[PDB]
Design a binder for this molecule. Sequence first.
Ligand SMILES: CCN(CC)S(=O)(=O)c1cc(Nc2nccc(-c3ccnc(-c4ccc(NC(=O)NC)cc4)c3)n2)ccc1Cl
Ligand SMILES: O=P(O)(O)O[C@H]1[C@H](OP(=O)(O)O)[C@H](OP(=O)(O)O)[C@H](OP(=O)(O)O)[C@@H](OP(=O)(O)O)[C@H]1OP(=O)(O)O
Ligand SMILES: Nc1ncnc2c1ncn2[C@@H]1O[C@H](COP(=O)(O)OP(=O)(O)OP(=O)(O)O)[C@@H](O)[C@H]1O
Ligand SMILES: [Mg+2]
Lengths: 307, 820, 332
Amino acid sequence: KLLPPERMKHSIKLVDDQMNWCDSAIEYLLDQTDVLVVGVLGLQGTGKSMVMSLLSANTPEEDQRTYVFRAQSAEMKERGGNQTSGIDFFITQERIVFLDTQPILSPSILDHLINNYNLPHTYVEMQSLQIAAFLFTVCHVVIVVQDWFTDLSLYRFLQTAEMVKPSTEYYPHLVFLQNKARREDFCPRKLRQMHLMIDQLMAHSHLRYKGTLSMLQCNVFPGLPPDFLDSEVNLFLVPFMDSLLPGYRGHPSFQSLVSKLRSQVMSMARPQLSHTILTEKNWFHYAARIWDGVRKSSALAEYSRLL
Amino acid sequence: LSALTTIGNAKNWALSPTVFALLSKNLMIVHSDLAVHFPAIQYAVLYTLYSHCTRHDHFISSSTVTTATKKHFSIILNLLGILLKKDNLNQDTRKLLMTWALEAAVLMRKSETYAPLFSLPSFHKFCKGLLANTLVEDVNICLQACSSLHALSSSLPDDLLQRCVDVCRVQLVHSGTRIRQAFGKLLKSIPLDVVLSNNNHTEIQEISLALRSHMSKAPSNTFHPQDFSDVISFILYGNSHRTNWLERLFYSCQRLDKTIPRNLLKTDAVLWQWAIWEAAQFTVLSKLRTPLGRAQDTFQTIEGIIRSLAAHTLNPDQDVSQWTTADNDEGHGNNQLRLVLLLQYLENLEKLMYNAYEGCANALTSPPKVIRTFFYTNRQTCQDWLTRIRLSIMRVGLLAGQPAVTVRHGFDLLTEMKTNELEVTIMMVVEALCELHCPEAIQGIAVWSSSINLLWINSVAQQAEGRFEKASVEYQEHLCAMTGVDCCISSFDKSVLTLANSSPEVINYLGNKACECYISIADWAAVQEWQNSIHDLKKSTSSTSLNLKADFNYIKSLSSFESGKFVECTEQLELLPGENINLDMKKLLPNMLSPDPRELQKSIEVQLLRSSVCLATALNWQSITENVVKYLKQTSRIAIGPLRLSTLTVSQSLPVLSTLQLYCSSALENTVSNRLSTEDCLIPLFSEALRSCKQHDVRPWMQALRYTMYQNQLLEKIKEQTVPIRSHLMELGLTAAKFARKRGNVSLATRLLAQCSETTAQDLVQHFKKWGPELDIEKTKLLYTAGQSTHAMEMLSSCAISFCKSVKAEYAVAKSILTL
Amino acid sequence: KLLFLGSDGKSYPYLFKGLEDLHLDERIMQFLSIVNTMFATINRQETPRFHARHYSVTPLGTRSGLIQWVDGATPLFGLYKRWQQREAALQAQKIVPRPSELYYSKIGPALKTVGLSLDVSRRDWPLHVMKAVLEELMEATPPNLLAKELWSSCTTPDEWWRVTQSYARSTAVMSMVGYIIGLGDRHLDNVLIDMTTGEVVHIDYNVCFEKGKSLRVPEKVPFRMTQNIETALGVTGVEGVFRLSCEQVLHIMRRGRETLLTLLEAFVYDPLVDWTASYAVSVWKRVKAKLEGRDVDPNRRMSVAEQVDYVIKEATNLDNLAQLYEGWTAWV
Ligand SMILES: CCN(CC)S(=O)(=O)c1cc(Nc2nccc(-c3ccnc(-c4ccc(NC(=O)NC)cc4)c3)n2)ccc1Cl
Ligand SMILES: O=P(O)(O)O[C@H]1[C@H](OP(=O)(O)O)[C@H](OP(=O)(O)O)[C@H](OP(=O)(O)O)[C@@H](OP(=O)(O)O)[C@H]1OP(=O)(O)O
Ligand SMILES: Nc1ncnc2c1ncn2[C@@H]1O[C@H](COP(=O)(O)OP(=O)(O)OP(=O)(O)O)[C@@H](O)[C@H]1O
Ligand SMILES: [Mg+2]
């Protein structure tokens, strides 16, 4: 007399490809409070679907075909086209809501929009900005994935997006994840440089990007002292799938790192959104309301008129 | 470093700075602090040294050129120990060191001429490093360490084996599967003389400390109702509705804004305890308003479940659903696991309620004011409910084989009785104490109750100590004196035995206890006589309430098997439940199996007997080996149940019956595929237990002897060369005889003495007047304990005279003279 | 109080004592170690270990000294203090008085009503008044302060049973050792308990060798056997494993009393020991008489069972608990 409602087997489309709300996840929500929301931001081929699938209901021992979130296929990499479009949705058994996101400023979207108000570039930029604001207003934790380092363009985009939010103010947490890492990225000398440049590039970001999710506290570097770094920011690295010196790949096992990241993300804080207690159904309604409100907003139009 | 490999890997240059010393002593600063910022240099140096040493067989033969390399193995071992003992190593470096250690360990056992290498301090440091390498987050490292330890299992001192036992115990319950199997095999390879030791376990103590620290912390109130519902459904009904879910739940229940060790997060015991404690806290903190129903709904549900379980104890034919029927071998074990978790949950709930209505000091944090004010007004209701359910809780606890729960509940019930429900409480408490081998508590309760008709408690107190003969005699005398009819049976002389050491429920208890006591010493004739006496007494008394709760078919089967008559044994075994006799594998245990450990032990014994008779009939190499091996493997897999259950809680010890059954199953499995060709087919019970297992009774040696005689008699049907079992059998018989005599069991001791040598005091005198000296000393000791001091003295003096003109006469003349 | 650090990063706290000779303390600890050594054989075939917790002390001349510090031990007075605070808070809902003030608040009115006054000498006090005051005080403090503390500090029932048995055996051994030596001033602040294992350990080893009988308020109880201590052993009380443990301890001590006697003989002839703080001869004779079984008897020697029974009865009778110092806390 206490059986669960139902178990989700595959992700659903929360936002349509034409920027339209899709109310089809109510049957998978209950009247429970204290829910966790995860958002993801990144480039075209960063690997958001793979990381989200591995962190929600998948393990590296599985195959990309049975993953919760559909990943890129062999025939799609050659054409250089995106795979995930719109916004996805999936809830695990632990009552954890996972939200995916389509690529931002991806050339595939522009190419598909060419053969279809002034220029498509402005429309793509506005769409990315709107999705970023939505992810920054109703998500408890946001993870940023970057295929390569020193992009110098995503930080500015995030700073501009945080200033175009709709509305005792609340700032969601952020996580810097570097996908497809190499041995050169697993050295203390480079780690310090990464931390200093990150701190100097987000001096007045007004966000929570430090004091939580410390890499040094994850036992990755057993002998590295915490005082060696001036300020250990919330950063994490992910290596590839599992030469005068044989062996010595230069980084820990991929499974161990993904497991540690999953545990750290699962044990993250869950602060209140507004000055009222929100439930699963209430959270969904709030998300739909803010989505509709941001669609017909004035900040986006004002910013677009300047371009 | 890479270029130096040309000279390092040379096959024969005598330069001033030796390459070995250069990479082992000159470049020793790279392991101090350079390994933290530049681990590549350390890895390269270690790789070069390993490559240069592996080409010369790690310099083992040496331990001109030979004289120069006379101190290389010690240096290598010392370096390995120092590096492995560290806690700030890299993954690649640790893996390379583990591989090198495994190779060295395997090569160390390649020959028997390297025996002196097991005493150097370098070897001890290496073993310490290997022991410290296991029990880490990495799985491959643990597997490599376990394999290396299992390789050179022998030649290690008791100090290392003691820690290895604790490591295997804590690792027996892991979220993975390979780790459990590896540690299980390693544990099986350890002799029983160390596994049964009463030494303190550091790992169990650490787990207990972590749990205590977690409970002592302030409440978190982060447990969601869905998690509680899932746990309740998995405990009351067995369905969890989840697909390593414990680790995920534990990680999701934590918070980063606001401390259990990570290495202990992979253990199911810690996770289960944490989940139960959190569920109890959520139930108490929610004013008993759990999603299961209203405030009284939870009480009614728990009361009904406990009442049904308690009722099933009286009549095992009830066959309670969701608690007695399983679908495979996993369900049977899961049932017992759920029962244990339920008992723990009830205990935690009681502790929380007590701390919530009054408050503890330096133990648990005080709950909010609302909880205290709500529990203070409804304290009478809670006390009444607990008191009303204590009787059922005691029965449930005894059924699940948890005497501690019933002992605590009985003590609380007796304390609350400050004002015919009194005899039953004492009965249950006495039985529980008897199962824990605590004669002092039994005697104390007997004396305390004497001031309120309860003179039979002394018999149970004496029985708990191991004196089965005296206990049986006292039981028969008490039954005859309280019933009015003669219920005595043939046995040894009462005068000699003493010098060597009314309600229907009470009558039934005494009869059942006497039957179990007689079965313990393996006296089939006595059991038959007892059954006849009970039948006659019942027919001449019309009790209509006395009935022995023991399947006589199993007893008859055991007697036939021990007598060597396999023809009748097969027919008797055919009527036993479960899978048919071997001529499909997962569902070996039958349905409607009670969660009582006694039933599981009986089923395991039946399976072993079936396999033994099957092999005996098949013998008189793949005809009957492809199925027997699988059958024994499944039996051994099911026998790891109690061992894991003991580790689930902080018990600091393991059951002797379960451990012996598992060891016997493993020995049988090895003898089936080896046909008695290796020493691994013998029982690890040696004489070493004389100075380390004096707190156990004679029951454990009975199983070992029973299964050893089978192989001894089976040797007559093998023409190929086999290992000698006469020495092992004689050693086991002598040790068992010594332990039997050390407790007054004159009958069992005499039986063992007669068996090794191949009812009246004069009978022993007329039948008694490498292991020769031990046998003579044992005979003299038995005669002295039998009351014939003169005969024992004469035999000891004659023995001393004979040993004085012997060859060795080292531990015989001295012992004989001292005893005399 | 200071602190030292070792090579293994382990902290070893210590205590600095000045103007107080500690030569006798080292000898007492040596005696405790020697008596503990005799329990090596019995500790091989028994679940509860026969051990007496103790620390090490080293003198730094003639007045200074260092005393080893033990962590993880909680004094028994703490539980009583918390209970008093909880009771006061509960009463105020709908500081705490000191033992001296609380005892006087009850001994004053009784004496005034019986016809006497508080100005009379302490020795000139009726026995019934003291007995009544003690009985009234015992009925106020519940005996579950320590009995339930161990239960609330455990995790599993097996652990609770193990700690209970260990605590009972440790308490019996410690009490017997204190009675043989003659340790006095056993108040709540001089006894510590380890919730991790349940063992009991003493602290102030100053009033020993029957030195408590010469104070302004002589003590007749051999050891501390208050309501809380007796209740913490179980429902049986002092007739279960406590009596058996005491008998075993006495048997072991009497079997090897030669070592203790020789050690004490060497103790007397020590130029660095100052008993004054023929006295040593009297102390040695008293210890020898206690070990030989002729504690209080002209020529009859009491057996182990009789000695244990007499000691237990003399340490639990109400005729001796009432006539004692207020700070000894005879009601808790
Ligand atoms: C709650 C307050 N406390 C209890 C009172 S406590 O002290 O603060 C405390 C004490 C421990 N345990 C501990 N460990 C090591 C040493 C002592 C200790 C303490 C005081 N005095 C002595 C002492 C002094 C003199 C002599 N010698 C003579 O008298 N004549 C020759 C012998 C002994 C020893 N106590 C643990 C925690 C805490 Cl809190
Ligand atoms: O030689 P064992 O047969 O193995 O047993 C003896 C002896 O047993 P008995 O009491 O039956 O003579 C005693 O065992 P416990 O009484 O402690 O259980 C014990 O000491 P005691 O003889 O003083 O009683 C010790 O003998 P001991 O230490 O005196 O030499 C012991 O083993 P060992 O004789 O081999 O040492
Ligand atoms: N750490 C990694 N190492 C190597 N290959 C990776 C790694 N992470 C992802 N990939 C691969 O890169 C591709 C990532 O595409 P995927 O569909 O998983 O997500 P995505 O890059 O977020 O896609 P989208 O274009 O829809 O934004 C896949 O082919 C995946 O196998
Ligand atoms: Mg994608």
